[PDB]
């Protein structure tokens, strides 16, 4: 029972670290500029920005999965103690 509450906290810590690292470099990954004025450079930049945006959505989804898991760890501890 105690171990489940401990596990829930470690999971939430992991969630926070994943969200923090994502937020920390987002200003760099989503701000890629075309190195030149040509169409190829612009398409590369556009792709890399969209790729970064899609990664952030992926991490946010992972954050949700982790939080649900911690909630199950917390509910599991309280439910299986009564």
């Amino acid at each position: 029972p105690e171990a489940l509450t401990v596990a829930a906290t470690e999971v939430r810590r992991i969630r926070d670290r994943a969200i923090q690292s994502d937020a920390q470099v987002a200003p760099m990954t989503t701000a890629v500029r075309p190195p030149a004025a040509d169409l190829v450079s612009e398409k590369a930049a556009t792709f890399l920005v969209e790729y970064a945006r899609k990664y952030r959505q992926t991490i946010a989804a992972a954050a949700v999965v982790l939080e649900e898991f911690a909630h199950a760890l917390t509910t599991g501890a309280d439910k299986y103690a009564t």
Binding site: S21, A36, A37, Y55, L66, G76
Partner: protein, 173 residues
Amino acid sequence: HFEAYPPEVNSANIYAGPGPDSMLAAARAWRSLDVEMTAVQRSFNRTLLSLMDAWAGPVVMQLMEAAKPFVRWLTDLCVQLSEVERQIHEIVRAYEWAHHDMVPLAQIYNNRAERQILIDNNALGQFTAQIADLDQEYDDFWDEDGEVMRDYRLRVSDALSKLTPWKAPPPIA
């Protein structure tokens, strides 16, 4: 495609930008992201193990089984992250080569200038062969810028095709 543009345009465009510093900064960012998420992966596995040996029960083993797809997904994610910096470097390299190989604007202008001068003094037709030489050189400039831009597009498209679309994580609950 870019072969429809005169070399004046293709050369000017490749020289105009801010350069690749923005892309290189992004590359350093993706690397750190890769490092952090690798540590996140380790911590998630240490937690599951630390939960197992501390209180081994039917409830815990169920949760351990439910998380197996997610640790699997995490591995795939980390692999995919370590791929990004390498492909950005490939794109930067492609740009650098295009920039280096494009016909300098000075050479194009000097050609057109020299050609006009010969034409201005060709009433007697003594410069016709040389004017032909300059038109040939300009045509070569045109085709060369076209080829450089073609290879650039091909190299960038190749690099982008290695960047797999991100997959949504499986639930643990």
